């Protein structure tokens, strides 16, 4: 078991969580100097040239030693915790893992990391052709996105479907996981989270080809199976049905920017007040959040900065 | 499709909606350029003036004759660009009919 | 202008999400000989012309940064589209050619 040590390391960890008065001296800086400010904190003890994917590199080896250890260093009900988080970021590794293995193309251009499935179970994945040879080399850590995928693979190959399936039942199993450890900050999030996660995946997966009812996913509110289906043929008086949410300011509106920029904000906010609950997993899924959204902002900035973007095409997204 | 430009630009071609892999290589991108319009079957070939192809008169040239897959001036990078309006006004007007 | 405004954003987040679009797509861009070729008479004999019209997409791409993906996906309309402009004027131009070096001629 154990988060004693783990929570320790995480608070001295947020030490070195970068400031918003980071972002504002950042915004009036170009690239080169962007660099020079970013070389003085945590990111930049990973950085490395000049060039922009030379700088996306340098995120991911930070990512890597100070999140992608963490389920690594703890074990028993500790570690089934931290990873729930990290099955999210490994389920964008899977689905690219087996877009390379089936339409032939090289390991290569995908996007790994390490955590509960590491860079090797990747590669051993990928060195196992047979789609029995794939489905047992996933089962030996006997993780959630295994289970979801021995049963969602019998019925079907066709890889598109596969992962919307995938998708589907690994959110079922997880949903009940994550309420299941009754702790109330997660419970809070996971709601809304979950909500946002179902309006954003219609945005982002429409025209497809596929099934609407296979995107939609287990800690819903107002929203069910047909109102996702009206959604994904693009119609957004769904949202004007849609109400009890913190979001619902959000409704009314078409333009993609302004709904995206709500729904992250909130759940920012919503996770920060993770560490009125840091015993257990509260401390550690808030240090997650805060670090993927510095990330995010670190590639925004830069970016912007490079190419000479306007100030304001980031500003308003940096200050929530 | 082939359509190559800058870096940021270029990820989209990536994508759909145009297909490429390419950015800059030269001065218009010549190492890709040449090579790949030699086959020609591309859906279409697209060079962005983030490269500029000055001469564009060494492809067709070359090629002597295919208005099929060959290059489309559009822009390529931003700068509040829409400036291919008085860019291709004495484009037009200089070397074909009446000057400006 | 908005064609380049949410591109030029994107390039870090993703860049093998290429694969994503492209794969998860049922038709949505022809590699090779997609596009809509177009025979023409005109002085200079048969020229054939043609226009960019192939399906290009819009909000079809999932990953990337939330905002700027699905913004970048829409810009595909203003590809394709706006280069049909292009794809008959400039066309015209090469027509036009033949007209004048014969006519000066």
């Not at chain 1, 995928?149 to 994550?178: G, P, S, W």
């Not at chain 3, 380049?4 to 861009?29: C, N, T």
């Not at chain 3, 997409?57 to 394709?80: K, N």
């Amino acid at each position: 078991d154990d988060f004693a040590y783990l929570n320790a390391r995480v608070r001295v960890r947020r030490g070195t969580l970068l400031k918003e008065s980071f972002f504002q001296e950042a915004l009036d800086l170009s690239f080169a100097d962007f660099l020079r400010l970013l070389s003085e904190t945590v990111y930049g003890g990973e950085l490395a040239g000049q060039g922009l994917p030379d700088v996306d590199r340098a995120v991911l080896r930070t990512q890597a030693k100070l999140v992608g250890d963490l389920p690594r260093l703890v074990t028993g009900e500790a570690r089934e915790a931290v990873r729930l988080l990290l099955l999210r970021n490994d389920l964008h590794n899977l689905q690219a893992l087996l877009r390379a293995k089936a339409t032939g193309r090289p390991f290569e251009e995908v996007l790994l990391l390490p955590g509960t499935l590491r860079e090797e179970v990747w590669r051993q994945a990928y060195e196992a052709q047979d789609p029995a040879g794939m489905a047992q080399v996933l089962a030996v850590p006997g993780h959630p996105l295994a289970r979801a995928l021995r049963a969602v693979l019998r019925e079907t190959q066709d890889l598109a479907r596969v992962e919307a399936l995938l998708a589907k039942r690994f959110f079922e199993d997880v949903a009940k996981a994550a309420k299941g450890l009754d702790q109330p900050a997660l419970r809070d999030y996971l709601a809304l989270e979950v909500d946002a996660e179902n309006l954003r995946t219609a945005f982002k997966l429409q025209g497809s080809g596929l099934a609407p009812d296979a995107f939609f996913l287990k800690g819903g509110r107002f929203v069910d199976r047909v109102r996702f289906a009206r959604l994904m043929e693009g119609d957004y008086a769904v949202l004007d049905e849609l109400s009890g949410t913190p979001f619902s300011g959000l409704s009314g509106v078409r333009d993609l920017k302004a709904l995206e920029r709500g729904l992250r904000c909130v759940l920012l906010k919503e996770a920060k007040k993770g560490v009125q609950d840091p015993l257990g997993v509260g401390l550690v899924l808030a240090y997650v959040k805060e670090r993927e959204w510095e990330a995010v902002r670190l590639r925004l900035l830069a970016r912007r900065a490079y190419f000479g973007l306007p100030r304001a095409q980031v500003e308003e997204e940096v200050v929530c | 499709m082939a359509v190559i430009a800058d870096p940021e630009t270029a990820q989209g071609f990536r994508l759909a909606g145009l297909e490429g892999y390419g950015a800059s290589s030269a001065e218009e991108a010549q190492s890709l350029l040449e090579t790949l319009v030699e086959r020609g079957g591309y859906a279409l070939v697209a060079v962005d003036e983030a490269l500029l192809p000055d001469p564009e008169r060494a492809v067709e040239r070359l090629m002597r004759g295919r208005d099929l897959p060959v290059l489309l001036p559009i822009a390529g990078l931003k700068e509040a660009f829409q400036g291919h309006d008085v860019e291709g006004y004495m484009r037009e007007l200089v070397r074909k009919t009446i000057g400006f | 202008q908005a064609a380049k405004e949410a591109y030029a954003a994107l390039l870090l987040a993703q860049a093998f999400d290429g694969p994503e679009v492209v794969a998860g797509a049922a038709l949505g861009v022809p590699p090779l000989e997609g596009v809509e070729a177009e025979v023409e008479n005109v002085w200079g004999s048969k020229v054939p012309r043609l226009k960019a019209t192939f399906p290009d997409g819009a909000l079809l791409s999932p990953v990337g940064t939330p905002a700027y993906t699905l913004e970048a996906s829409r810009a595909f309309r203003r590809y394709a589209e706006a280069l049909i402009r292009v794809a008959n004027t400039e066309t015209r131009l090469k027509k036009i050619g033949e007209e004048i070096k014969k006519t000066t001629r």
